Design a protein around this nucleic acid. Structure first.
Length: 705
RNA sequence: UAGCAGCACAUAAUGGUUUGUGGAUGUUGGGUGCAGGCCAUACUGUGCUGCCUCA
């Protein structure tokens, strides 16, 4: 069925408007952004297993810049988890409206290809570099501080030096001889990436110079137990005789193969070619996939924020407000993506508000429709099927973050195309599209409030925007008004809330059921909002349990009794009065729970809402003090099913019998606890019977301890 | 800077199981829809390893 977990559809991945077809043209205006990088949380030495120097990206003059034909909007700064620790990333506009020659652009584009294909090794047989044909079409280039002025500019000299370098295309063929002996220059290695010239020619291993040992030489002990010295090693393995046996040695670290950095984890110089790119900049380059991917994701969320400000009139289209793009990114992220956050908290809050909004709308739009009809209409509008259709219509599937980020397996680099797919497409369940709509609603609600959330629903396509008899029938309710600490402006709502369908003496208002319908959704929402805003920051699972335990007719009935609602209840059913008196007796001492007592509790919430001029706050002011003791009790001690508690205490020993229908229509259930006895429970339903059996077993077990 | 095979965990897919829930021919409750918790087949990622490339 549409909106079901069992139905899956494939969708193309969305690329932000500011990155789509964004390739700089010769002699045309372009934009240059600096990738600002700051080490905000250094990695502890215990996690840094080699205890290597942490390299704050900010300690070095060279960085990367993004060159694009279209402007990039302001995005929140975001963390990246490097081997140095948490690095906060900023994307900062450095130059706008400037032009580049064909030769300058060719140098930039060639170096851009060189980064992704040669440095990062992301170009695969399935991928082709087509910068003019690629959907995501921007260039990345080196920036450097000009003359120590602290001002960053395009390092053209360095790009040209990379082009003149033979080391660009492969391993340099410069073999040293006794006539042309190798000369070590320290300045050339302090911030160098090196390539060993005698091995692994198809995939040359690259290393960062971590340090230069001036005390160690080719005659010193080799790190592999296979050889006595560095000179013996090269002579034995590659037949290479060194010209300079007194040259210093390089301490080196492998260039990182891990390109996903979005979450926390917790040699002889003469025989090496110097890669023309410095090690500092190469460390920055390794972050480009996570940075660009995150940038792309945040730009998609900002695009959705801006689109919603245009379509719903919620927030401002361009920031100097609407929700933070990071919260939108949360609402667009499935738990499968493993990105440190998920849509589940926002989804649950949205659902509760959605119910409230539709319930209110239906109640006001259909003044003559009975509860069962409003409940039926409600059930259709809030369905996972309808929500899926709305999310699909809004283009959410192409914007959702569904799978774990893996650059060489599921990411397309800028300027590349796929040779005709984990790079361009994703498979999504219809239910997940529905869940995302509720999470977006929760985002707008938490960030911009209820009116904004309603305007957001309207933007998705959900339309969400006698007197003598009265005085006689309300006689004595003044004590009730004082007990609840609320005075009704229109006592007809109070009368309606306490009028059962059997109470035909009331010919001036309806029965309580319509207000029950309205109140149910109000209480669910208010309770859910409160639980979501709770300082304990309950998990999605715990929020579900607490919502289930607090939003319950039994609890509403228990409160109705404690607050004397039963004394004001108007009914003409002696049996109902006896059931209420028996339940009231049971509640006063500490057995069927009278449904009507929970219903009138909800109906009075509906009454107060209508009498207060649709003020949820007034309703909450009245109900929160009544519910606060229970909210505190269950949020301190998250509740349990007696069947589950018995199964937790006795998992292999407690076995329940099938449902036995007794001669009176009532169900009987027996629980056998191996070595501890058999306990029988009876009730009008299998759980009432099974729970009664489980409670009898639990009582016996606890009494024998 | 490489590949593979075990173990932990997360995770979606296709089956089953179990709690909640719905209007339904509802002769007095087994027809189907959606959620949770489990069992199985099979996917990916990180990590604890193990073998195994270069050093």
């Amino acid at each position: 069925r549409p909106g079901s977990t069992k139905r899956r559809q494939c969708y193309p991945k969305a690329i932000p408007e500011c990155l789509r077809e964004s390739y700089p043209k010769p002699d045309q205006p372009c934009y240059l952004y600096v990738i600002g990088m700051v080490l905000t949380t250094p990695l502890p030495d215990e996690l840094n297993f080699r205890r290597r120097k942490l390299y704050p990206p900010e300690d070095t003059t060279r960085c990367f810049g993004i060159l694009t034909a279209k402007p990039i909007p302001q995005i929140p700064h975001f963390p990246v988890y490097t081997r140095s620790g948490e690095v906060t990333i900023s994307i900062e506009l450095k130059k706008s409206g400037f032009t580049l020659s064909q030769q300058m652009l060719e140098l930039i584009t060639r170096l851009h290809q060189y980064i992704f294909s040669h440095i990062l090794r992301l170009e695969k047989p399935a991928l082709e570099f087509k910068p003019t044909g690629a959907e995501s079409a921007y260039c990345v280039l080196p920036l450097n501080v000009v003359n120590d002025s602290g001002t960053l500019d395009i390092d053209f000299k360095f790009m040209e030096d990379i082009e003149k370098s033979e080391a660009r295309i492969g391993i340099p063929s410069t073999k040293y001889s006794k006539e042309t002996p190798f000369v070590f220059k320290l300045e050339d290695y302090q911030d160098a990436v090196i390539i060993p010239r005698y091995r692994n020619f198809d995939q040359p291993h690259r290393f960062y110079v971590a340090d230069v040992y001036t005390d160690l030489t080719p005659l010193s002990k080799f790190p592999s137990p296979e050889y006595e010295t560095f000179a013996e090693y090269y002579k034995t393995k590659y037949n290479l005789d060194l010209t300079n046996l007194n040259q210093p040695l390089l301490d080196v670290d492998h260039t990182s193969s891990r390109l996903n950095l979005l979450t926390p984890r917790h040699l002889v110089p003469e025989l090496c070619a110097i890669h023309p790119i410095p090690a500092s900049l190469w460390r920055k380059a390794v972050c480009l996939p996570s940075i660009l991917y995150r940038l792309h994701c945040l730009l998609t969320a900002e695009e959705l924020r801006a689109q919603t400000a245009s379509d719903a009139g919620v927030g401002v289209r361009s920031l100097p407000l609407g929700p933070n793009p990071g919260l939108i990114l949360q609402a667009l992220t499935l738990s499968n993506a493993s990105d440190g956050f998920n849509l589940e908290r926002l989804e649950m809050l949205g659902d509760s508000f959605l119910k409230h909004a539709i319930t209110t709308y239906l109640f006001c739009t259909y003044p003559d429709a009975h509860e069962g009809r409003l409940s039926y209409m409600r059930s259709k509008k809030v369905s996972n099927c309808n929500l899926y259709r709305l999310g699909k219509k809004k283009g959410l599937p192409s914007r959702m973050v569904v799978s774990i980020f893996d650059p060489p397996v599921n990411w397309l680099p800028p300027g590349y195309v796929v040779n005709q797919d984990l790079h361009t497409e994703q498979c999504i369940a219809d239910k997940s599209i529905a869940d995302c709509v509720e999470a977006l609603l929760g985002c707008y609600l938490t960030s911009c409030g209820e009116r904004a959330a309603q305007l957001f629903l309207c933007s998705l396509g959900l339309k969400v925007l006698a007197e003598k008899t009265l005085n006689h029938l309300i006689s004595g309710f003044e004590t009730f008004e004082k007990k609840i600490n609320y005075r009704f402006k229109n006592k007809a709502y109070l009368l309606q809330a306490f009028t059962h369908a059997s109470y035909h003496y009331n010919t001036i208002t309806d029965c309580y059921q319509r207000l029950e319908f309205l109140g149910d959704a109000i209480l669910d929402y208010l309770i859910t909002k409160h639980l979501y805003e709770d300082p304990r920051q309950h998990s999605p699972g715990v929020l579900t349990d607490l919502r289930s335990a607090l939003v319950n007719n039994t609890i509403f009935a228990s409160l109705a009794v404690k607050y004397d609602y039963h004394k004001y209840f108007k009914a003409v059913s002696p049996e109902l009065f006896h059931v209420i008196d028996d339940f009231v007796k049971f509640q006063l001492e500490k057995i069927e729970v009278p449904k009507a007592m929970g219903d009138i509790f909800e109906s009075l919430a509906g009454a107060i809402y209508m009498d207060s001029g649709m003020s949820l706050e007034v309703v909450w002011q009245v109900y929160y003090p009544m519910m606060q003791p229970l909210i505190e009790k269950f949020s301190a001690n998250v509740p349990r099913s007696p069947v589950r508690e018995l199964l937790e205490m006795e998992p292999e020993t407690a076995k329940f019998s099938p449902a036995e229908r007794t001669y009176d229509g009532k169900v009987r259930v027996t629980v056998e606890v191996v070595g501890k006895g058999k306990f029988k429970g009876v009730g009008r339903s299998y759980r009432i019977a099974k729970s009664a059996a489980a409670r009898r077993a639990l009582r016996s077990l606890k009494a024998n301890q």
